[PDB]
Design a protein around this motif. Structure first.
Motif, PDB file in Angstrom:
ATOM      1  N   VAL A   1       2.066  11.202  -7.518  1.00 29.62           N
ATOM      2  CA  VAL A   1       1.983   9.942  -6.728  1.00 29.62           C
ATOM      3  C   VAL A   1       2.652   8.846  -7.556  1.00 29.62           C
ATOM      4  O   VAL A   1       2.390   8.783  -8.775  1.00 29.62           O
ATOM      5  CB  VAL A   1       0.527   9.580  -6.379  1.00 29.62           C
TER       6      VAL A   1
ATOM      7  N   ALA B   1       3.615   4.625  -7.469  1.00 24.91           N
ATOM      8  CA  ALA B   1       3.608   3.256  -6.955  1.00 24.91           C
ATOM      9  C   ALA B   1       4.717   2.497  -7.676  1.00 24.91           C
ATOM     10  O   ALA B   1       4.565   2.116  -8.839  1.00 24.91           O
ATOM     11  CB  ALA B   1       2.253   2.596  -7.169  1.00 24.91           C
TER      12      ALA B   1
ATOM     13  N   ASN C   1      -6.033   0.373  -5.831  1.00 26.27           N
ATOM     14  CA  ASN C   1      -4.865  -0.507  -5.569  1.00 26.27           C
ATOM     15  C   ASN C   1      -5.369  -1.951  -5.613  1.00 26.27           C
ATOM     16  O   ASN C   1      -6.311  -2.262  -4.864  1.00 26.27           O
ATOM     17  CB  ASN C   1      -4.202  -0.178  -4.229  1.00 26.27           C
TER      18      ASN C   1
ATOM     19  N   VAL D   1       3.062   4.197  -1.126  1.00 24.55           N
ATOM     20  CA  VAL D   1       3.404   4.922  -2.335  1.00 24.55           C
ATOM     21  C   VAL D   1       4.234   6.137  -1.942  1.00 24.55           C
ATOM     22  O   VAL D   1       4.460   6.408  -0.763  1.00 24.55           O
ATOM     23  CB  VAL D   1       2.161   5.363  -3.138  1.00 24.55           C
TER      24      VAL D   1
ATOM     25  N   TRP E   1      -1.999   3.814   0.119  1.00 24.82           N
ATOM     26  CA  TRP E   1      -2.855   3.642  -1.052  1.00 24.82           C
ATOM     27  C   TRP E   1      -3.852   2.515  -0.799  1.00 24.82           C
ATOM     28  O   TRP E   1      -3.483   1.339  -0.826  1.00 24.82           O
ATOM     29  CB  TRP E   1      -1.998   3.337  -2.279  1.00 24.82           C
TER      30      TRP E   1
ATOM     31  N   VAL F   1      -5.246   7.790  -1.797  1.00 31.28           N
ATOM     32  CA  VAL F   1      -3.929   7.838  -1.168  1.00 31.28           C
ATOM     33  C   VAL F   1      -4.006   8.812  -0.004  1.00 31.28           C
ATOM     34  O   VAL F   1      -4.458   9.946  -0.177  1.00 31.28           O
ATOM     35  CB  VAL F   1      -2.842   8.264  -2.166  1.00 31.28           C
TER      36      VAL F   1
ATOM     37  N   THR G   1      -4.996  -4.018  -2.195  1.00 29.24           N
ATOM     38  CA  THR G   1      -5.723  -3.504  -1.035  1.00 29.24           C
ATOM     39  C   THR G   1      -6.205  -4.636  -0.138  1.00 29.24           C
ATOM     40  O   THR G   1      -7.070  -5.415  -0.540  1.00 29.24           O
ATOM     41  CB  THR G   1      -6.928  -2.670  -1.474  1.00 29.24           C
TER      42      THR G   1
ATOM     43  N   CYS H   1       0.805  -1.210   0.000  1.00 26.13           N
ATOM     44  CA  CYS H   1       0.000   0.000   0.000  1.00 26.13           C
ATOM     45  C   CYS H   1       0.837   1.258   0.000  1.00 26.13           C
ATOM     46  O   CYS H   1       0.301   2.335  -0.290  1.00 26.13           O
ATOM     47  CB  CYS H   1      -0.948   0.016   1.210  1.00 26.13           C
TER      48      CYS H   1
END
Length: 300
Positions: free
Chosen positions: A68, A70, A95, A18, A31, A36, A98, A16
């Motif tokens: 942002v 990832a 995401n 980022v 995230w 976010v 998640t 999660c």
């Protein structure tokens, strides 16, 4: 056997984390689904921490002022929001890593696992307790803000902490995931400092049960004490008062060892007044107050 400060496995949080950039500031974000979360002080420049008006600062930003990231994949911000001291960047893609999660606020004296992060990349994990003065004794360097703390309840991740700052004594302050600070701390440049702390009594008894369960018994004695008498001594040594509910919480440990709680209290009283006389308990020369009764049950 053995007893050691233990952290939850971090895999479910790692996916999660980022990286969030806004201007010349980079920190970590969390995230979940298409949102976010990160400290709102990202949208404030260092030169302006003294007097930020976040309402104004957020009106003057656009979605494209937040980068942002990832890993290698850039997330595109399609909305931005501010819940108390936390910023919410709505992004285009949920995401896919998640986990089931909850946002929970913890009480002073409870513990949780910190996932220290830099530039969105997890770097280390370790257990912390919420001090009675609403600080934690963590380990964070520049770029750590947005790191989060959490507990794991059977595949469900309880987020309870987001890192916002380091007070001048070298301890750490932050918010829950609703952006509400723990303690009298604000995200603006001030002389703010940790208030006086106190020892978390129920935890020290937990850790003494952990020690007898691991064969350390040299502090046990035949005496037992009354709750009120013990509390007169506790307060003399800056220990938080012990309640019947705390006693009830230690029930399972007392039954596994067969030592009544007020019996252990008589042991803790004597330790407070004489020290250990060169001995150690679970390899330590001080009384440890950062294991809850549940942390002990979980390792026995």
């Amino acid at each position: 056997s053995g007893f050691r400060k233990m952290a939850f496995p971090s895999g479910k949080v790692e996916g999660c984390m980022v990286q969030v950039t806004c201007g010349t500031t980079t920190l970590n974000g969390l995230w979940l689904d298409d949102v976010v979360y990160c400290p709102r002080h990202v949208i404030c420049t260092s030169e302006d921490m003294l007097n930020p008006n976040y309402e104004d600062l957020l009106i003057r930003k656009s979605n494209h002022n937040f980068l942002v990231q990832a890993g290698n994949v850039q997330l595109r911000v399609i909305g931005h929001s501010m819940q108390n001291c936390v910023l919410k960047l709505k992004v285009d893609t949920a995401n896919p890593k998640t986990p089931k999660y909850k946002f929970v606020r913890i009480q002073p004296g409870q513990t949780f696992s910190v996932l220290a992060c830099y530039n969105g990349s997890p770097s280390g994990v370790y257990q912390c307790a919420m001090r009675p003065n609403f600080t934690i004794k963590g380990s964070f360097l520049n770029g750590s803000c947005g790191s989060v703390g959490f507990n794991i309840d059977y595949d469900c991740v309880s987020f309870c902490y987001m890192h916002h700052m380091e007070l001048p004594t070298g301890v750490h302050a932050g918010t829950d995931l609703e952006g509400n600070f723990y303690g009298p701390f604000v995200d603006r440049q001030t002389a703010q400092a940790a208030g006086t702390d106190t020892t978390i009594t129920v935890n020290v008894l937990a850790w003494l049960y952990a020690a007898v369960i691991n064969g350390d018994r040299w502090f046990l004695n035949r005496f037992t004490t009354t709750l009120n008498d013990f509390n007169l001594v506790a307060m003399k040594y800056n220990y938080e008062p012990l309640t019947q509910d705390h006693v009830d919480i230690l029930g399972p440990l007392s039954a596994q060892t067969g030592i009544a709680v007020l019996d252990m209290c008589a042991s803790l009283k004597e330790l407070l007044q004489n020290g250990m006389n060169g001995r150690t308990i679970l390899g330590s020369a001080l009384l440890e107050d950062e294991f809850t009764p549940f942390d002990v049950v979980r390792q026995c």
